[PDB]
Amino acid sequence: MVPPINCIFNFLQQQTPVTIWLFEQIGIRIKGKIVGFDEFMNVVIDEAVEIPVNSKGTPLGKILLKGDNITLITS
Amino acid sequence: SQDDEYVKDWLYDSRPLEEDSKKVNGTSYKKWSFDLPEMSNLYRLSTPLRDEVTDKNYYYLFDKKSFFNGKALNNAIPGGPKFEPLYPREEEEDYNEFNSIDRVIFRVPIRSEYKVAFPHLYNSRPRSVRIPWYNNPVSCIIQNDEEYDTPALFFDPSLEDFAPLLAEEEELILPNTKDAMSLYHSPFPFNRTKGKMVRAQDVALAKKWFLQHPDEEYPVKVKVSYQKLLKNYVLNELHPT
Amino acid sequence: NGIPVKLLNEAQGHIVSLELTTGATYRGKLVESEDSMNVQLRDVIATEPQGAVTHMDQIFVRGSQIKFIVVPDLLKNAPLFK
């Protein structure tokens, strides 16, 4: 078995490309690299980029995305 | 005053327990309920007469059932009683091929002890034979030197703002509890602490002794007497009026 | 402990029905539940708000997104109540 926390830790260690989907919001996504870790799914993510979904790119700085509104993580 | 503290006041009264008390029904004197310590005292007193074996397994082949079986099979358990046989021994085998000494083997002597224990097996053509008991062993140790919860006769094994239940008890074993324990394992009369009253007639203090296996190194006459008593008992038991 | 949860647990085995917040009704053999109503079912149909049915083998469902769970009338009779 591989827990979610463990996975998160691994991702952090890596510093590989991550693409986050927002909760209750289909049209917008985020794409960055995981820097932080918390007890909840909340993580700080430098080099983030906002993406409008194909139903391309937009300018965006360094961000911490809150745990409550996460959907997807991948790295 | 020390040992027999409770019983002494009433023990030797005409009506063994007083009228107008909470320990008996009343002046009709039909029912009684006792406290523990008094009961314990009584038990202690009665050591001579109530001398009974707390081990139930002791009565192996001295059961009423066993006696009945013996009677049926005309087979004395040597200690116990003997009767006229139920059935006349019709010795009419006629040297048949069954039960012959040509045929069978005699490793075991097939004692009549074994007959009343497995009547339907070892005895052939059993009639009116009741079924006997077949029991567990009784590891029950009572301390005679005035001590409390001790592995004496046997051997040891090889190897958030709260407390456990019944906290503030401060003592596992209450001062009366050894006595209580003793009472617990004892037989019918004292086991209980409430009862219906029997007539003085209807108590039997001799009975118990004769039911027991007789104490060894007694004379022959005594043994005979015991046997007779047993027979008397057994017959009474058998034919229920 | 939650009595509805207990009831749900009891219903384990039976052909239960199950609607979500989305409004998509399921109906099938209940497999397993937890303190939070983490239901599982077997041999289960699935109808959307439109009405188009879709059959499926093994479904797991999360209690938060579950709206209400229909049990058969047999468990009305006994025995966890009193």
Add this chain to the structure above:
Amino acid sequence: VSTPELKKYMDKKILLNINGSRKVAGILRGYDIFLNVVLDDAMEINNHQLGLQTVIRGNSIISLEALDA
């Protein structure tokens, strides 16, 4: 308190039905008490793949229908 009993669904391909009428696919790798799924990545419902390995949050899950029996 109790762990989600998803040991039957371990190493099987599951259609995770998620919030906003969306769907995810993939083989099941791991899980925890909050129902955060860990699964090897697959296509989002014609169809197109994103990511190698994926970790889905518990709150987002509407359902998870087993593709493999």
Add this chain to the structure above:
Amino acid sequence: EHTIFTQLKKNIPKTRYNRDYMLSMANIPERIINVGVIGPLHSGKTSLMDLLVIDSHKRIPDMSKNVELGWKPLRYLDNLKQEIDRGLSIKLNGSTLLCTDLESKSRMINFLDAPGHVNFMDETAVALAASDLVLIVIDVVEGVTFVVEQLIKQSIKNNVAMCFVINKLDRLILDLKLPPMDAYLKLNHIIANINSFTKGNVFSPIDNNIIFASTKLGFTFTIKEFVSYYYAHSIPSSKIDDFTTRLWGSVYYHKGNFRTKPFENVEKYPTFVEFILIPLYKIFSYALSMEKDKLKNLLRSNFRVNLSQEALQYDPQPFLKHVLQLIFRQQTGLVDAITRCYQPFELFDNKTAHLSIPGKSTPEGTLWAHVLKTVDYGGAEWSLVRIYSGLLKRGDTVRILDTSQSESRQKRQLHDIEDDETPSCEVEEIGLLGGRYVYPVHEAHKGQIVLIKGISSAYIKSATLYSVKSKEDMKQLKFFKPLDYITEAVFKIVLQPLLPRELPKLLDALNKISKYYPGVIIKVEESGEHVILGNGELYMDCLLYDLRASYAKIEIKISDPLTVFSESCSNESFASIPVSNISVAAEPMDSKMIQDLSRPRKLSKILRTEYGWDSLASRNVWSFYNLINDTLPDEISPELLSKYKEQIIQGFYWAVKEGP
């Protein structure tokens, strides 16, 4: 009327749960547990069963006043006159009880209280076969005897969930008068012993497999149950499991809010002793000894339980029992433990395989059911059958096969790999063995046991009944092997009827005995002398009683108890002697090898090699039964006369049966 008895009418003991619900539950598998409770002699399995029954039911007619009070045990399931009068549970007369767990939800449970005594181990075996979990009840005092070990081994062999019941704590509390610490130590020792006898699975009171019982005094409890009852008020929901885990394994309280694995100097005893055993002891002593009012007050405070005004005036032992009942609530803890033990239902398949052969599952295609034991439950013959798959309806036409004709059938099937329905019967009436009453039912579903009336007359002992609808289905099906009644029988009692006039009657009686008592070989010899090869003395006696009273009522002669002897050879055969109107050698096998035997040609050869390190040619030739038969001349490999030797081997079997 009758002397050997059941209820005989529909004024049955009414039940606290409604029976309809139970029936409904029985429809669906996964919500049925066949328990089959087992142990040694007088461990108290029957007592436990009785207690369970009492818990289930409202007001039972058979239970007198005395029994209710506590005094006499209600031995419920020993309903037979014999099993009463004798004191032994002799036959399988279990129960079907809707039993709740710690999780309030409830499940139907087919208990089977086997005999403890070691000559009815056939019965025990049968129970094991029936049942999917097995409660191994053990006398605390006697501990893990060899018998217990044997039972455990048997359970392991025929794949079953072993949920232990360490019974008769009363004996250590009061009879022995062990100190609480001493008692705890004893318990630990027992547990260790159990573990040792077990192959792998570690049993302890944590995990809820060991169950601490005192079935006379009328309480069973797993520590979990205890915790639930009495350590919820204090300890919050998060650490309750943790607390439970802590309790047993040599940890202490440290006079402080969290526990520690080291020994502490101020406090004396471990957590189990402090949080359970000690409490129990206190309860006991107080019940026996303490001022009643004080005790009542304590109950009100600590356990949150009130003594009735009537229950205060009780006699000591009865009072104690009552108190225990009040404390340790109606036995759900045990049920919970059982459930926990049998949370894996993957074992079921394994068990089935063991019973029959490595099976391909075909549930919807056909109904099939292991007829286990015939019984004379309510005077009339019923058959204790476990429906394994399908549903067995009343008045269904059903094919049956005695396990005698199982191996042969299998062989035939293999060979095959026309409809040859050899026998069959109609199901007269299905019922649930509910101890003293048979509550009747129309259906009977997968994974549950039931009494069926029509089957009995087909087979002798242990049948497989099935209702197919196809050739493919038939092919798929398998046939349960004969029950290995662990105790082999070598107590040879020879009969003759005393009046030859009524030989038919005697024969009938014998047949009945064979049907009912499974651990009973009945050889009808050439000399007109019937022979019964019973298991032991007591068992034999019981059988005789049954025959010579209930299933015949005949005057019957009986031999001295002999044994089945068996011929063998010490040295090897010296003379190569042929026979005419064949020459075969003789030599004993290896002792170890023999033992192994007691407990594909290439594969066989390999096995042989592993066992004794014999020659390969010998292995190749070998083909044994019952012992060993080779075909090891020179010309047999060239010759076709020696080839095809099944018929030849049949002949040998006769020889094996009846030696020189």
Add this chain to the structure above:
Amino acid sequence: IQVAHSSRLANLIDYKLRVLTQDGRVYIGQLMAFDKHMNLVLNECIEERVPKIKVEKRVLGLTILRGEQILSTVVEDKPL
């Protein structure tokens, strides 16, 4: 509609209760059991749904209604 002046929800057990929900549906049924988190067990439940005109009716039976989705509970009628 008539009903006694009740104090708590637990005291009005087995009364015929109307139950309003966030989606718009109205579940009518007798309250068999309650929860700390307002989950209700309903005896002979009937779902009344109002689409965007007139009350569409659906008979259910024994139902376990979760507390999250409930808006409020009105007493429709007495027991029996």
Add this chain to the structure above:
RNA sequence: CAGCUUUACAGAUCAAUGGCGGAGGGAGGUCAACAUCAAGAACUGUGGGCGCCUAUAGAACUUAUAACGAACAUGGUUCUUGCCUUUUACCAGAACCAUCCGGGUGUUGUCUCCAUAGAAACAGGUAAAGCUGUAUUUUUU
């Protein structure tokens, strides 16, 4: 330290509804009369379905090494025995039977010894007894 249910409390409007209501004894007698206590493990009614099923219920007592007795006598009858030779009076076993010395349970009725109130809950307090409680993903932040 919250909540609801009950007593002990004023003064209420006193509807509303419950519950204690034709609201009135208790303890006991070596006191009665009756009933009933060995039968399909066995109880009694109630309607309904039509001598039997299905719901209602009730149930005091006695029972599983089977009994009202943790107790034990004696008769009568046959059959077999034994001392015996006549019988009674006896021996000891069997089968039926009875008698007796006792036992409960229930209902009345009495006898004795102690005693005496015909109305209280609601709005909620005052005080005390029964149980429950101690916002970051699945309930209410």
